[PDB]
Amino acid sequence: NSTAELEELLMQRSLTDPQLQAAAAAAADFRILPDATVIKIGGQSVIDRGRAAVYPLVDEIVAARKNHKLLIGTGAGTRARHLYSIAAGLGLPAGVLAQLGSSVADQNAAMLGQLLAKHGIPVVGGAGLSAVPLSLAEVNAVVFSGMPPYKLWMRPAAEGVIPPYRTDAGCFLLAEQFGCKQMIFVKDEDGLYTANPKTSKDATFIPRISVDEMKAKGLHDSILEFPVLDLLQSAQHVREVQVVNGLVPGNLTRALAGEHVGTIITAS
Amino acid sequence: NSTAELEELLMQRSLTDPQLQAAAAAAADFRILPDATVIKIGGQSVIDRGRAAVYPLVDEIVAARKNHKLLIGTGAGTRARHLYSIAAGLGLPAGVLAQLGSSVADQNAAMLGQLLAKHGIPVVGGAGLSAVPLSLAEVNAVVFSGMPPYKLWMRPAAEGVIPPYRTDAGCFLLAEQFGCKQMIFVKDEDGLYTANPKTSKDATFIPRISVDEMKAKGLHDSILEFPVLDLLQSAQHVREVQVVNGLVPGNLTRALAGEHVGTIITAS
Amino acid sequence: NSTAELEELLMQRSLTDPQLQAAAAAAADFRILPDATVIKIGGQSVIDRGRAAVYPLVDEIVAARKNHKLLIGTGAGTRARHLYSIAAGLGLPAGVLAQLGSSVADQNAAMLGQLLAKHGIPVVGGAGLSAVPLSLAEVNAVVFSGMPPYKLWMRPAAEGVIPPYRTDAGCFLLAEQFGCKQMIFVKDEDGLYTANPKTSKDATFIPRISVDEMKAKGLHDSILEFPVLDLLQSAQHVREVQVVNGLVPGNLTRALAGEHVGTIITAS
Amino acid sequence: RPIRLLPWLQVVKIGGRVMDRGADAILPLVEELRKLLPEHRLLILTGAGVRARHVFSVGLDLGLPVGSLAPLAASEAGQNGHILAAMLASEGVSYVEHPTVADQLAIHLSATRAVVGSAFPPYHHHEFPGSRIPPHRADTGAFLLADAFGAAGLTIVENVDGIYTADPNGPDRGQARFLPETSATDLAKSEGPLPVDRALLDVMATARHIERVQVVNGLVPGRLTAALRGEHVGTLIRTGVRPA
Amino acid sequence: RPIRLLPWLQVVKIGGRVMDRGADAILPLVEELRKLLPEHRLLILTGAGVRARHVFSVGLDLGLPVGSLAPLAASEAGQNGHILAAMLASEGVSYVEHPTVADQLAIHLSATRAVVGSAFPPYHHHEFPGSRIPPHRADTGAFLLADAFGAAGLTIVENVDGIYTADPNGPDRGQARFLPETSATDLAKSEGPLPVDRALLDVMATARHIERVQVVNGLVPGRLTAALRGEHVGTLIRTGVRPA
Amino acid sequence: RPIRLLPWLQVVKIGGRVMDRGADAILPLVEELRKLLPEHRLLILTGAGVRARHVFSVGLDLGLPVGSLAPLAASEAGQNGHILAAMLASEGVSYVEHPTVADQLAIHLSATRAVVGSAFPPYHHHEFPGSRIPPHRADTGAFLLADAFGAAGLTIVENVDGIYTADPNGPDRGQARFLPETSATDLAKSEGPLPVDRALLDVMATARHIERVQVVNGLVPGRLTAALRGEHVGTLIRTGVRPA
Ligand SMILES: Nc1ncnc2c1ncn2[C@@H]1O[C@H](COP(=O)(O)OP(=O)(O)OP(=O)(O)O)[C@@H](O)[C@H]1O
Ligand SMILES: Nc1ncnc2c1ncn2[C@@H]1O[C@H](COP(=O)(O)OP(=O)(O)OP(=O)(O)O)[C@@H](O)[C@H]1O
Ligand SMILES: Nc1ncnc2c1ncn2[C@@H]1O[C@H](COP(=O)(O)OP(=O)(O)OP(=O)(O)O)[C@@H](O)[C@H]1O
Ligand code: MOO
Ligand code: MOO
Ligand code: MOO
Ligand SMILES: [Mg+2]
Ligand SMILES: [Mg+2]
Ligand SMILES: [Mg+2]
C-alpha cells in the first residue's frame, strides 16, 4: 500500500473494485473533534415531559460545559408519531415521512435553545463545524436537531413506511463522523432490561452487553433504534455507547465524569 | 389552575375559548435575555445625518458594551419615505410597502456594522438568538435591522397604505419577546414635548408621562409610532421606554447608567 | 470640496460626470479591518499536493494566529482546470465557467476547515464581516473560498473563455476592500523569476519589482494572474503584495514576522 | 383603494382539525380539489390543528413567551401543507414557501393550476403581546394574504357547518343555534368561543377588498365546490367593506 | 465564439430615474409592457435611481470604501424591480433573484412570458478599486447578462432621447447635440458625462454576440415597442462585434 | 404499498464518466435528449466522474472520514448537472437544487418538459461508516428518488454496453462476458467490480415500485431512446418487486 498505488487504482478502477476498497481502507484516520461528547436528549422520554424533566437537565448542561465540550442533539417525540400516523394512513412513502419528522426535532431544539440562550449556548445547523462556540470556554456547547438529512432519499425499512433512521441514528452518525470520544443517549429508563420495563414486571437490568449478544436474545429493537446497533458495529471511531436515565438528578453529570451509570453497549 | 386542567382545555376547546385563554395566562414566565438592553438608532434622526452623528454614537457603543449587553436596531429614514411615496402613488397596498421599507433598514444596519466590525460587533439576522456574541465580554453586542417580518402579511392602518408597524415597533417587540430589562429610543430631540418642537416655538418638555395621559392630550402620534404605544400597554416584560437625544454627546452612555435623561413613557 | 457641494453634484449630475467623480475622490477613507492579513493558500501549488504540503501549513496557521489576525483564502487547482477544459470544448462562455470554478475552491476550503475545526477556526461565507472570530484571541482567524462572486456576470478576457478573475483576484480584492495591512500569496516557488523556473534552467530570482517593470520585461502573466497586477495599480489600501513558497517549512511564519522572504511586488 | 394584485385568485383555507382526521377526511377532500383545478386558480393554505396544542402545552409548561410559541405552531401548519401537496403532486401541485408566496405567486400560478402553502403569517418572535396564545393564526394569515392580493374570494373549510351561538361540541351544545349569516362587527362584540380567530374580525375591519367570507363544512363533499361558486352552504361573514 | 444560451431572449433595462418619476411615468410604461408580453420573451431589469445617490452621500460621509457602496446601491435597483413586478403581477410576471436569473432563467421563462430582476451585477465587496463610485452599475450588469446569454438584443430605456454631445439637463445644454448613432470606441475616448456607465463601453469591447444597443426615451409611449422591432428611434451604439 | 407520487415520471441517470469524455460524447447525447423532450416527462440526474476520484485522493491523503468525502464527491455531480443543463437551456431546461427536487418537482415539470439535478443523495456527513469510500453514490441516489416517486422507470446511461462478468476495461478483459439480464440478488452475492454502486443492490431489495432498471451505453446514439420505450438494448436488472 502506497499513495501512488492508491491514486492509480482510484483513476483506473471502479469504486466497487475490491482492490480499490482495500487500498482506501489503509489511509490515515483524522479525528475532527476528538475532545467532544455527543449527547441526545430524548423527545418522548424527556422534552415531551415538560418543566419537571427539562429544567434539571438544563442545569446539568450549564454546569457540565465548564469541564466538558458538548454537542446536544434533540429527539422528536409524540408529535412526530402523530404525523407518521396521518401520513402512513394516506399511503405516503418513508421519504415523505422523514421530512415531517425533522420539523418536530427542530421544534424541540428551538425550545431547548431558548432556555440556554442566556448562558451563551446557541442552536446550530452544522454542529460538528461550529468551531467557534465549541472552542470558547465561555460557551463550549451547541444544540442541534437530531434527524438525519436524508429527506426523500431516506432508505425505507423492510416493512412499513416509518423511517428507520431517526434521531438516535442522526446523533450517533455525528459522533462517528467527527471522531468524538463519547456518545450518551438520555432516555427515561435506567438502561437496558431483559424485557420492556414499562409493560413487564420481572425485567432484569443489564449493565453491559455487546450488539451480538443483544441480537441472540431478541433485544435488537428495544431501548435504541435497531438500525443504530448495526451502524455501531460498522463504526470507525465510536465503538460503544451509553444509555442513561435523564429523569434521575445528576445522572448526566455523573456519566460525563466516567461513572458507569446506565447501560454500556459495545460494538464487539 | 393546574397543568392537567390546562392540557385538557388545550385539547378540547377552541383557542378562542375564554376559559382556555384564562388558564394559559397563569403559566410561568421565562425571560430569555433578561440582562440585555435594546437600543434603536434612528434612521432619519441619526444615521441619515452622516459622520457628525454616527461617529460619536459608535464611540459610545464601543465604550458601553464593556458594562452593558446591547441589542442595537436601526431605523429606515428618508429613502424609505421615498419608496413609500412612489408605491403609494401607484396604489400598492401596505403589505408591498412593508417589504420596501425593510431593505432601507438593512442598508443602515450594514453601514453601522462595518464601522463596528473591527471592534468585534457583528450584524445578525436573529439578534435575540445570537447567544455567543451576547455572552462574550469581548463582544457583548450585536446589530440588527429594526423592521418587523410581516412583509405582505402586514396589518394595514385604518386609512392609507403606510405600514403602521415599522422600526420603532420592530425593536420594541424584540425587547418584549426576549424579556429585556430596558428599551431606549435614540432620536434627534431631547424628548417628548407638548407640541412638535421643530414646528412650534412654545412646546414644553415632558420628563415623564403614561400612555393614557398621552392620548388624553393629543400626543398619541408624535415622537413614537402611535401603534407602539398600544403595544406597550399590552406588554408583559417591558412596561416603560425611554427616548433620548442621540445628537448630544454621552446621552446614550448616561441613559445606560440610570440617569433620567430624555422622556420616560410608562404603560400605566 | 465640501459635503454640501458633493451632495448637490450627487443629486444633479450623472455618476459619469468628471466633476462628480473628482468630488467623491476627496471623501474620507475608512479601513474596516486594518489589523488583519489576507493569505491565499494555492490550490494547484499547495492543497492539491496533499498531506506533505497541507499539514505543515496548518501547524503554521495555528501558531501564527496567536500574534496575527488572519483571513485565509483557498485556491482551486487541477479539478477546476478539468472543468474549464470540458466546458470550453462545448463552447460555454466565461460566465458559466466562473460558477464551475467556485465549487472547486469551496471543496478546498471545506477540507482545510475540517483540519482547523478543533482549533476553533471556522469556514465562513463573509470573511471580512465575520467580526466575532477575528476579534477573539482564542480564534483570531477564518477560512474562506477565494473565487469572486461574479458568476454569469464575469467579465471575459480579450480572447478565450477562461475566467480572468479567479482566486488570486478574489483574495486580493478582499484585502483591498477591508483595508487590510498585508496580502501574502502562498505558492510552490520561492518567488518571481526572470522566466518560468519549472521549464527554464537559467531563470534569475527577483526579490523586488514594480508592476510597470514586470510589464516592460514580459512578466505580466507569470506567478500571479495578470488581471490582479492591474487591480494592484488601482488599489487604495493595499499597494504591495508578497509571494512566498509554502513548501518551505516556516516560510509563512517568517513572512508574517516581517522577513523579506520571496518576492515583493509594488504597485508603483 | 389600492389596486388588486391578483384579482383572478381564489384562496381556500383548510382547517388543521380537518387534516387531523386522516385519510377518512383527506381523501374525499383531495378528490374534490382535483375536480376544482380546471375551474379556478387556487391558493390552498393549511392550518395547524391538534399538534399545535401539544407544543403549546410543552412550551407553556417551560414558560416560553408568546413570540416563542408562534413559530412553533406555524411549523405544524406547514407540515399539513406538505402532506396535502404530496397527495396532489400527480396533478402538478406543490408546496411553496412563504417568501415565494409573497413575491412569486404570479409566476407559480402561471406554471400550474394550484399551489399549497402555510396559512400562518410570518410574525414569529414579533407576535403581539397580551395573551399567552399567539393571536395571529391560520384564519388571520389567510385573510391578510387574500385581501392584500385583492383576490376574488376567501373560503374557510372547517369541521363544522359554520358558526353557532355556542360551541356545538362543548359543554353547552343544547343551546347552540346555527348562524347562516353575520357581520364581523357583530361577532367581535360577542363573548364566547368561535371557530375562527378573534384577530380575523380585527383585520376584517381594516380590509380594502374582500367583502364576505364563507365558513363551510369540509366533511360534506360538494360544499367547497358550491362555496367557490358563491352558493350559500355555510356561514357568511360580512367584512364591512362596501361594494361599489 | 461561444454558443448562445438563450438566443430567443430579449433584455430590457429600465433606468432608475424613470422609476423615480412615479405613476406619471410608470403607468404608461406598464401598459406598453403589457402589450409586449405576447410578442417577445422578456427579461426586464431595473436600475437604481436617486435613492442610490442618497446612500452614496451617507456612505461617503462615513468614509466607506467602494466595495461597501456597491451592494448598497444595488439594493435600490432591486426595490425598483419589486415595484415594477407588482404592477405586472396580474399578467403572471414576478421578480426573480440573481441566482435564479443565473441558473434557472430558462424554466422561469417557460412558465411565463416575462420576469423582472435587478440590473446591478453581484460584484458587492469584490467591486474594482480606483474610483470611490462603484463602476459596474445597472447598464454594465444588463449588458454582461445579455451578452453571456447570447440574447437577441438589449434595449436601454432612459429619461432622455439618447446620447448627446453634452448633458442636455446640465450647465451646457445649449451646446448639446443629439447623436443618432455612435460606436463604443468613439464614446470611450471622449471626456464628459454620458447617460450610460463608462464601464459599459469596456465590456462592449470584449463582447462576443451583441452587435448593437439602442438607448431610447421611455417617457415617449411607443418607442420601446419600436426599438424591440429594430426601428431607429434613439441612439444606436455599435459594440464592435462583427456580424457574420 | 405506498401510493405513486409522480407515476408519469421517467428518470434518467447520466454517468459522470460519460460527461468526462467532453463534447465528443456530450453533443450527441444533448441532441438525443432534445428529441426526447416532447415524448417524456424527464428528470435527468448526473453522476460525478473522474473529478471525484481526485478529491478522494486528496481527502484520503489528509485522512478525512467518509462523511467528509461524500459531499466533496457530490459537488462534482452537481457541476456536471450545470454543464448539461446549460446545453439544453434554449429548450427550457434548467438545473434544480435538491430541496426543489424533493418538494417542488411537480410544479417545475408542469412549467417545462425536463429538469436536471444531481444524482448524489444528500447524506453528507451522515454517510454510513464501514468503507472509506462513500457507499451511497449516484446510482443509489437516482434509484431512491425514482422509487420514492413511484416513477414509470429508471434508466442508467453508462460508457459500456452493460454489466459483464468482469471489468471489460480492467486486467481480465479476456474473460469478461456480457450479461443481457440479471437480478439484484444474483449480483449482490457476487464478488468483483460492477458498473453500478453495490448499495444500489441493497436499496433494490427494499424497493416498493420499480420492477426493473436497464443499463445502456450512452456512447451509441439511439439506445437511450430505445430504453425509454422498453426495448432491450443493454443489461436489465430485476429488482425483486413483483408485478400485480
Ligand atoms: N361558536 C362556535 N361555532 C362553531 N364552532 C365552534 C364555536 N365555538 C367553538 N367551536 C369549535 O371549534 C372547532 C374548530 O376548531 P378550530 O377552529 O380550532 O380548528 P381549525 O380551524 O381546523 O384549526 P386551525 O385554526 O389550526 O386551522 C369546532 O369543531 C367547534 O367544536
Ligand atoms: N451625454 C449625455 N447625453 C444624454 N444624457 C446625459 C449625458 N450626460 C449626462 N446625461 C444625463 O444623465 C441622465 C440620466 O441619468 P442616469 O443614467 O444616471 O439615470 P438612470 O440610468 O435612469 O439610473 P440607473 O443608472 O441607476 O438606472 C439624463 O437625464 C441626462 O440629464
Ligand atoms: N462487471 C462490470 N461490467 C461492466 N463494467 C465494469 C464492471 N466492473 C467494472 N466496470 C467498469 O466501470 C466503468 C464505469 O465506471 P463508473 O460506473 O465508476 O462511472 P460512472 O457511473 O459514469 O460515474 P458515476 O458513478 O460517478 O456517475 C466501466 O467503464 C467499466 O470499465
Ligand atoms: O418555488 Mo419555485 O420559485 O416553484 O420556480
Ligand atoms: O424563483 Mo422560481 O425558481 O419562480 O420556480
Ligand atoms: O427552482 Mo424554481 O422553484 O424554477 O420556480
Ligand atoms: Mg377554525
Ligand atoms: Mg442611464
Ligand atoms: Mg457506473
Single out the residue of D58, E20, E109 nearest to residue B87, CA to CA: E20
What residue in C sits closest to F73 (Cα-Cα)? C107
Among chain F residues, CA nearest to E148: F86
Q: Which helix (H) or strand (E) holds A131?
A: helix A131-135
Q: Which residues of E touch D105 (CB under 8 A)?
A: 89, 94
Which cell numbers hold the place of F33?
A: 435528449
Mutate to test the interface with C, among F55, F56, F62, F118 (most CBs of C within 10 A): F62
Residues of chain D contacting F104 with CB distance shorter than 8 Å: 94-96
Report chain C residues whose CB lies below 8 A from the CB of B50: 3
Nearest ligand 2 atom to alpha carbon E156: 21
Q: Quick one: which atom of ligand 3 is closest to the CA of F119?
A: 27
Contacts of D33 in chain F (CB under 8 A): none
Q: Is A151 left (phi over 0), alpha (psi -120 to 50) or beta?
A: left
- Cβ <8 Å between D126 and B18: no
Contact by Cβ (8 Å): A84, A117: no
Note the Cα F173 to chain centre separation in Å.
24
Answer for the pair E52, E138: CB distance below 8 angstroms, yes or no: no
Sign of the CA dihedral running C254, C256, C259, C261: positive
Interface probe with B: pick from D97, D128, D194, most Cβ of B within 10 Å: D128
- Which whole-number Å values give the CA distances from D55 to A71, B23, D48, in the listed order? 24, 16, 11
Place of cell 438502561: A191
Strand partners, A72: A39, A143
Taking contacts as CB-CB distances below 8 angstroms, the residues of chain A near F133 are 15, 20-21, 24
Inter-chain contact A117–B129, Cβ cutoff 8 Å?
yes
Chains C and B touch (3+ CB pairs under 8 A): yes
Scan for cell 422498453, then name that residue.
Answer: F230
Q: Are strands B182-187 and B240-245 parallel, antiparallel or unpaired?
A: parallel
Chain A residues within 8 angstroms (CB to CB) of chain C: 3, 28, 30-35, 128-132, 134-136
The secondary structure of F16-30, three-state, reads HHHHHCCHHHHHHHH
Domains, chain B = 1-268 (3.40.1160.10)
Q: Do E91 and D106 touch (CB under 8 A)?
A: yes
Asked if F7 and F210 touch (Cβ cutoff 8 Å), the reply is no
User: Which residue puts its alpha carbon closest to atom 1 of ligand 6?
Assistant: F96
Count of helices and strands (H, E) across chain E: 9, 7
- What are the contacts of C246-249 at 24+ separation with CB within 8 A? C246/C41, C246/C42, C246/C45, C246/C46, C246/C53, C246/C57, C246/C186, C246/C187, C246/C188, C247/C46, C247/C49, C247/C53, C247/C188, C248/C190, C249/C56
Is C touching E (3+ C-beta pairs, cut-off 8 A)?
Answer: yes
Q: Is F111's CB within 8 Å of D115's CB?
A: no
Q: Does chain D reach chain A with at least 3 CB pairs under 8 Å?
A: yes
Alpha-carbon gap, residue B9 to B28, rounded angstroms: 17
The b/e string for E17-56 (b: 16+ C-beta within 10 A; e otherwise) is bbbbbeeebbeebbebbeebbeebbbbbbbbbbebbbbbb
Give A167→chain B minimum CA distance, Å. 24
Which of C153, C228, C237 is the best residue to mutate to test the E interface, defined by the most E CB atoms within 10 Å of its own CB?
Answer: C153
- Separation CA B39–CA B60 (nearest Å): 12
- Burial of residue C217, with CB atoms counted within 10 A of its CB: 0-12 exposed, 13-18 middle, 19 or more buried: exposed
Distance from CA of B152 to the nearest CA of E (A): 12
Residue D71, by phi and psi: left (phi above 0), alpha (psi -120 to 50) or beta? alpha
Subunits with 3+ Cβ pairs within 8 Å of D are A, B, E, F
| Interhelix angle A78-89/A94-116, nearest 10 degrees | 160
Mark yes or no for CB contact D65/B7 under 8 Å. Answer: no
Can you tell me the distance from the alpha carbon of C254 to that of C248, in angstroms, rounded to the nearest whole number?
Answer: 11
Cβ contact F22–C83 (<8 Å): no
Whether residue F208 lies within 8 A of chain E, CB to CB, comes out as no
Report the gap between the CA of E144 and the closest CA in chain C (Å): 6
Q: How many Å apart are CA D68 and CA F125, to the nearest integer?
A: 30
Distance, in Å, from the CA atom of B83 to the CA atom of B166, rounded to the nearest integer, reads 14
Question: Chain B neighbours among D 29-88 (CB < 8 Å)?
Answer: 50, 53-54, 56-57, 60-68
Q: Is E30 in the pocket of ligand 2 (CB under 6 A)?
A: no
CA distance B237 to chain D (A): 9
Chain E neighbours (≥3 Cβ pairs under 8 A) are B, C, D, F
**B136–A117 C-beta distance less than 8 A:** no
Nearest CA in chain D to F107: D92
Per the CB < 8 A criterion, the answer to whether B19 and B10 are in contact is: no
Closest CA to D30 of D234, D218, D212, D187: D218
Residues of B in Cβ contact (< 8 Å) with E71: 110
Residue B16: CB partners within 8 Å, gap ≥ 6?
A: D193, D194, D196, D197, D198
Q: Which helix (H) or strand (E) holds E44?
A: strand E41-46
Cα end-to-end span (Å), chain E: 11
The rounded radius of gyration (Å) of the Cα atoms in chain D is 17
Do C13 and E128 count as a contact with CB atoms less than 8 A apart?
no
CA dist., res. E33 & res. E12, Å (int): 10
Please say whether the beta carbons of F73 and F48 come within 8 A: yes
Contacts of F156 (CB under 8 A, 6+ apart): F13, F15, F139, F142, F196, F213, F214, F215, F216
Tell me if C97 sits within 8 A of F79, measured CB to CB.
no
Residue A92 to residue A112: CA distance in whole angstroms: 31
- Are E82 and D105 inside 8 Å of each other by CB? no
Distance CA C116, CA A30 (A): 12
Residues 6+ apart with CB under 8 A from E200: E139, E140, E143, E184
DSSP H helices, B136-239, are 167-177, 211-215, 226-234
Q: Which domains does chain E have, with CATH numbers?
A: 1-244 (3.40.1160.10)
CA separation for the pair F143, F210 (Å, rounded): 9
Q: Do F167 and A13 touch (CB under 8 A)?
A: yes
Q: Whose CA is nearest to atom 1 of ligand 4?
A: D96
Q: Tell me the torsion sign for CA atoms E1, E6, E8, E11.
A: negative
Query: Which residue type sits at E28?
Result: P
Judging by DSSP bridges, how do beta strands A240-245 and A182-187 pair with one another?
parallel
The CA distance from B219 to A41, in Å, is 52
| Single-letter code of the amino acid located at C55 | Y
Distance of CA A174 to the CA centre of its chain: 7
- As a whole number of angstroms, the distance between CA D194 and CA D181 comes to 14
Do chain E and F touch: 3 or more Cβ pairs under 8 angstroms? yes
Q: Which of B132, B138, B180 to mutate to test the interface with A (most CBs of A within 10 A)?
A: B132
